[PDB]
Every structure is written in structure tokens, then in C-alpha cells.
Amino acid sequence: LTILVKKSTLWLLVGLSVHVVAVMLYLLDRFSTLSSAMWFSWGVLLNSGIGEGAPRSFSARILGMVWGFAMIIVASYTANLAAFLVLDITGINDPRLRNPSDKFIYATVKQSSV
Amino acid sequence: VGSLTINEERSEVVDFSVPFIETGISVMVSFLEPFSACVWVMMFVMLLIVSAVAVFVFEYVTIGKAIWLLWGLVFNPKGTTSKIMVSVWAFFAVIFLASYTANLAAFMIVSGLSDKKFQRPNDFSPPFRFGTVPNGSTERNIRNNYAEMHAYMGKFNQRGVDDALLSLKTGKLDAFIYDAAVLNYMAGRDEGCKLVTIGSGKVFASTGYGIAIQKDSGWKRQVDLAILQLFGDGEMEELEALWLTGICHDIDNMAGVFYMLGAAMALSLITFISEHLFYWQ
Amino acid sequence: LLWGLVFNPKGTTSKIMVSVWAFFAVIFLASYTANLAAFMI
Amino acid sequence: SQKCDVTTGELFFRSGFGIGMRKDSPWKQQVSLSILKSHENGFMEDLDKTWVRYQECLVAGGIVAGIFLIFIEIAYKSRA
Amino acid sequence: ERVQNSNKKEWNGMMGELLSGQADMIVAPLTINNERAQYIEFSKPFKYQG
């Protein structure tokens, strides 16, 4: 006997971070190509040493080193795809059968031995 | 023969000679940085090693381009041996990134409320919404023991058990104080898995279940021996195998990254202030 | 350069296209790594 | 919980915690009443906190290959 | 344990002592069985384990 059954807010904040980083760094550089500062910081956010030119101020190169921010956000969305993606009743047992309900429907063939 | 929660006064009134089924009283209510640094310290040691060695191989755009290129090894000349060093430590970079992605994928796989919320008089963040039954020993015990909670609880009286079940189920009520073992059978009764309080195994009483007989008769010693035998025969385990069956049996890491971002930001700001000072020397 | 988009000028809009389809490339590589990890079970 | 070396499975047989004494000790009524009072006045919970609160429980080879290869290329470029 | 001598099943230890009247009170972790309870008096247990 067997039973047959029928078969978002992160992007805006990091964009504000890109914008604030670019304007603050090149204002500090001009005190002691801002469209290009936007495009440079945007391209190195996108895991790409963009263009050909490093900033001649070494401090902005150090800040490009510490902003490993593209790598850690790569790590976070790979953890998300490890979590959001793939990661995740026998008739002998209880769950819906020994204490059943009408949402689980039962039938046999009438005038038979079962 | 109806199973009763044994207090002093039921033992005062009648005779108890039964090994009881124990129970108590409850209330129905409705990280990747040990892994970086252990790799990161050997990584920075290796960084100092390879920077010193790559300076040594070109005893022949220099002092700052080198360590930038070492950081760009992970962040994907004319000395051919320098390109060999780039090749080997880039293989090191990709194997370390693969092992760390495997490590983060490996990571990818309320009991003390009785005083601070309920015994604590007159305040919680919502107002008090408790549940009674207008009989039973639980009401009497909280009456003679926690009379503040008794006064706060008796504001909302319930006409049985299922009225409180549907009020907690609709969220109209927040608390319903009852004998806990009936709620443990209710753990094997509800299917929606909005189920049962704390589940720590700790009930906030220690009483039992059994039979009341007449005091000072010629009585029923053999029934006590027989029920202890049926206990020892595992027939209680048979009985729960009959009836007691069951059904249901971020933000902080992002802010913790952003706080270290702000700390490195302040470090770079005071570094720039010092470098702005350093033409005055 | 289109094949080097997956395999990690002066027209700024061309670099905009590079950035958008490089985002496309890395999200497709991430979904395919998730697909082979689904096959790995 | 104290010694960190683990229990397995559930409670395989329900068991209690009894006392032993001689027969005809009629003060056991008030003894069981004081048992229920310790259960009532939370003295069992005082013992519960006071005792159950104690729960407690390649690089070097590449380096020498490089120190070979530097003299290899020294010889190759001094000859060519 | 059953005594190997003729037809005796005798308690030992604390229970053999209280059986022999060598105790007014025995306090111990006691899962009191039928054979314990058929000889003695005892107040109610208070801790329930498994």
C-alpha cells in the first residue's frame, strides 16, 4: 500500500559615498576634472583600475587602497547569493494523516478490499 | 481522577497518594572578523616580505607604485623575475580569495521577561494586556504571591481557553497566564507555528498531575504500586506516543563596516592635516 | 574589449556602456557560479 | 556544562528525586507543605539561580628558486 | 540484590541501612521504585529529570 500524490537602499548610500569622497578629496587636493573625479571613483568602485592615471597625491592612492570596499561588497553579495539562492509526507507518520484535516483530501475506490 | 495541580491547600482538603505528572505555570505570548585578521597578519607579513624582495631585485613610480600594485594583486614592468613574483603571488591572491569565499559560504550555513516586563509595575512600551481564567490555581497563586501582577492581569478576563487563543492569535492580547503543560500539549496541537512561549524547558512552578482520594480510608496502596509500575513499564511513554504528537517540533554588519569607514576617514583627515602642516618644517 | 569585459577610450558614454555591461558580466558570472554550486550538490 | 568534554539524546525515561525515611513519620505532611512552600516562595528558584547559574559549557621554495633565477638571468644577460 | 543464600533479596548501602533502621533520614538522588516504596515512608519528590 502506497500513496499517490500530485507532482536598493545600499546603492544610493554608496553613491553618496562616491560623490562625497570625490568632492572632498579633490577639494583637499586643490586647496593644498571633478567630473573625472566622479568617473574615476565610480570606475574603481566597479572593480576596475580605471583609465591610466593614479592621483599624484599619494593620500588619494591610499584612500583608493582602503576603498577594498569594492571587494567587501563583492563578498557581501556572494554571501547573499549563498543565502538567498540554492541554500534551501509519508503516510506511516503523523503530520497531516494521523490527525488529519479537510484541507488534505482522502479517497479510496469504493467496493474494494482496502 | 481529573489531573489537578497540587498546591498546599488541595493537600489540606483531600488525600494525595499518586506519583504525579510534573508541570508548572507559564504565560502564553506570541562575524566575518575572526576570519580576516588571522589571514591578514600573515598577509601583511608577506606584503612586507615581497615589497622588500621586489625592491632588492631591482637594485639597478618606485616607492608608492610598488605597494599599490601589491594591493592591486588582489584587486584585479621590465623585470621578468618581478613578473614571476606577480604571477606567483597573484596565484596566492586567487587561492586566498577562493578560500575566503568558501569560508563566508561556510558561515552562510526572553526567559527573564517575568520581572522586567510583567512584574515591573505600570510600564512597558505597549500598555499591559494580560490574560486570566476566573478559576483555577494559577489565578490564586499569582493572587497570593504577585498581587500587583494579579491586579494588572485581572483587568482583562477571558471566558475560557479558546477566547484567549483567538485573542493572542489575532494579537489583540499580549499575555495569557496558564498551566504550562496544557500549553505544551498545545505545542503538539497548533500547526501555524505561532505557537508557544520561551521553550527553554523552565516552567515557573513545579507541581504535578494526579488523583485525589479520601483521607484516612482503607485505601488504594496497590493502585499506587501499579501506577508506579506502569510508569516503570514506559506506559506513560506509550500514552504520549498516542496523544502527545506534534507539528512544529541585515543592518548591523553594514553599519559596522560604515563605522570603520568613518574611523579610517578621520584617520585620513588628521593625516592630511599633518601633511598640510609639514611644509611648515 | 567586449570579451575582456567578462575577462577581468575617450568616449565617456562608451565607458558608461563598459561599466553597465561589466556589471552585467559580474552578475552573470555570480549567477553561473551559483548555478554550478547548485550542480555541486 | 562545567567540564567541557556532551550529552546526547532526549530524556529516555522520566525520573524524579525522592527522599528516604522510616515508616510512621507523620510530620511528612508539613514536610511536603514546606516543599510546596519552597516551590511557592521561590526558594527552589533561589537554589536554581545559585547552582544552575554555574553552567559554563611554497614561499621559501619560490624564494630560493628566485635566488637561483636572478643569477641565471645575470649569466644570460652578461653573455647576451 | 538476591542473596545467594536461601531465598533472600536484600537491599544494600543506604537502603540496606534504612531497612535495618540505621537511618532516620536518607537524603540522596532517589528514583524511588516499587521495591523501595513498598518498604518505606517518604515525602513527595520535588525535582523531575530524565
UniProtKB/Swiss-Prot annotation, chain A:
* Post-translational modifications reported in the UniProt record: NMDA is probably regulated by C-terminal phosphorylation of an isoform of NR1 by PKC. Its phosphorylated state is influenced by the formation of the NMDAR-PPP2CB complex and the NMDAR channel activity.
Q: Which residues lie within the membrane without crossing it?
A: 34-55
Which compartment or compartments is the protein found in?
Answer: Cell membrane; Postsynaptic cell membrane; Synaptic cell membrane; Postsynaptic density membrane
Q: In which tissues is it expressed?
A: Detected throughout the brain, in brain cortex, cerebellum, thalamus and olfactory bulb.
Q: What stretches pass through the bilayer?
A: 8-28, 62-77
Glycosylated where?
99
Q: Which residues lie on this side of the membrane: Cytoplasmic?
A: 56-61
Region Pore-forming, annotated ranges: 34-55
Specify which residues bind glycine according to the UniProt entry for this protein.
Answer: 113
Task: Describe, as the record does, how this protein assembles with itself and its partners.
Answer: Heterotetramer; the NMDAR subunits are modular and harbor tiered domains that function in concert to regulate opening and closing of the cation-selective ion channel pore. Forms heterotetrameric channels composed of two GluN1/zeta subunits (GRIN1), and two identical GluN2/epsilon subunits (GRIN2A, GRIN2B, GRIN2C or GRIN2D) or GluN3 subunits (GRIN3A or GRIN3B) (in vitro). Can also form heterotetrameric channels that contain at least two GluN1 subunits and at least two different GluN2 subunits (or a combination of one GluN2 and one GluN3 subunits) (in vitro).
Q: Which family does it belong to?
A: Belongs to the glutamate-gated ion channel (TC 1.A.10.1) family. NR1/GRIN1 subfamily.
Please describe what this protein does.
Component of N-methyl-D-aspartate (NMDA) receptors (NMDARs) that function as heterotetrameric, ligand-gated cation channels with high calcium permeability and voltage-dependent block by Mg(2+). NMDARs participate in synaptic plasticity for learning and memory formation by contributing to the long-term potentiation (LTP). Channel activation requires binding of the neurotransmitter L-glutamate to the GluN2 subunit, glycine or D-serine binding to the GluN1 subunit, plus membrane depolarization to eliminate channel inhibition by Mg(2+).
Protein name in the entry: Glutamate receptor ionotropic, NMDA 1
Span within the full-length protein is 538 to 689 of 938
Curated annotation (Swiss-Prot), chain B:
Q: Which domain of life is it from?
A: Eukaryota
Q: Which residue windows are transmembrane per the record?
A: 39-57, 85-100, 254-273
Q: Which organism is it from?
A: Rattus norvegicus
* Post-translational modification summary for this protein: Phosphorylated on tyrosine residues.
Q: Where is this site: Functional determinant of NMDA receptors?
A: 76
- What are the glycosylated positions? 135
Which part of the full protein does this chain span, and how long is the full protein? Answer: 510 to 845 of 1482
Report what the protein is called. Answer: Glutamate receptor ionotropic, NMDA 2B
Topology, Cytoplasmic side: 78-84
Q: Function of this protein?
A: Component of N-methyl-D-aspartate (NMDA) receptors (NMDARs) that function as heterotetrameric, ligand-gated cation channels with high calcium permeability and voltage-dependent block by Mg(2+). Participates in synaptic plasticity for learning and memory formation by contributing to the long-term depression (LTD) of hippocampus membrane currents. Channel activation requires binding of the neurotransmitter L-glutamate to the GluN2 subunit, glycine or D-serine binding to the GluN1 subunit, plus membrane depolarization to eliminate channel inhibition by Mg(2+).
The UniProt subunit note reads as follows: Heterotetramer. Forms heterotetrameric channels composed of two GluN1/zeta subunits (GRIN1), and two identical GluN2/epsilon subunits (GRIN2A, GRIN2B, GRIN2C or GRIN2D) or GluN3 subunits (GRIN3A or GRIN3B) (in vitro). Can also form heterotetrameric channels that contain at least two GluN1 subunits and at least two different GluN2 subunits (or a combination of one GluN2 and one GluN3 subunits) (in vitro). In vivo, the subunit composition may depend on the expression levels of the different subunits. Found in a complex with GRIN1, GRIN3A and PPP2CB. Found in a complex with GRIN1 and GRIN3B.
Q: What is the lineage of its organism?
A: Eukaryota, Metazoa, Chordata, Craniata, Vertebrata
For the region Pore-forming, what residue ranges are annotated? 65-77
Q: Which residues lie within the membrane without crossing it?
A: 65-77
Its gene name is Grin2b
Tissue-level expression: Expressed in the hippocampus including the dentate gyrus (at protein level). Detected in adult olfactory bulb, brain cortex, hippocampus, striatum, thalamus, superior colliculus, with much lower levels in inferior colliculus, midbrain and cerebellum.
Q: Which residues bind L-glutamate?
A: 5, 10, 137-138, 179
Extracellular-facing ranges: 101-253
Which cysteines link up through disulfide bonds?
Answer: 193-248
Curated annotation (Swiss-Prot), chain D:
Q: Which domain of life, per UniProt? A: Eukaryota
Report residues carrying sugar chains. 30
What S-S linkages are listed for this chain?
4-57
How would you summarize where this protein is expressed among tissues?
A: Detected throughout the brain, in brain cortex, cerebellum, thalamus and olfactory bulb.
Transmembrane regions: 58-72
PTM info:
NMDA is probably regulated by C-terminal phosphorylation of an isoform of NR1 by PKC. Its phosphorylated state is influenced by the formation of the NMDAR-PPP2CB complex and the NMDAR channel activity.
Q: Where in the cell is it found?
A: Cell membrane; Postsynaptic cell membrane; Synaptic cell membrane; Postsynaptic density membrane
Coiled-coil region(s): none
**Complex formation:** Heterotetramer; the NMDAR subunits are modular and harbor tiered domains that function in concert to regulate opening and closing of the cation-selective ion channel pore. Forms heterotetrameric channels composed of two GluN1/zeta subunits (GRIN1), and two identical GluN2/epsilon subunits (GRIN2A, GRIN2B, GRIN2C or GRIN2D) or GluN3 subunits (GRIN3A or GRIN3B) (in vitro). Can also form heterotetrameric channels that contain at least two GluN1 subunits and at least two different GluN2 subunits (or a combination of one GluN2 and one GluN3 subunits) (in vitro).
Q: Which family does it belong to?
A: Belongs to the glutamate-gated ion channel (TC 1.A.10.1) family. NR1/GRIN1 subfamily.
Domain comment (free text): A hydrophobic region that gives rise to the prediction of a transmembrane span does not cross the membrane, but is part of a discontinuously helical region that dips into the membrane and is probably part of the pore and of the selectivity filter.
What is this protein's record name?
Answer: Glutamate receptor ionotropic, NMDA 1
Q: Which residues of the full protein are shown?
A: 741 to 838 of 938
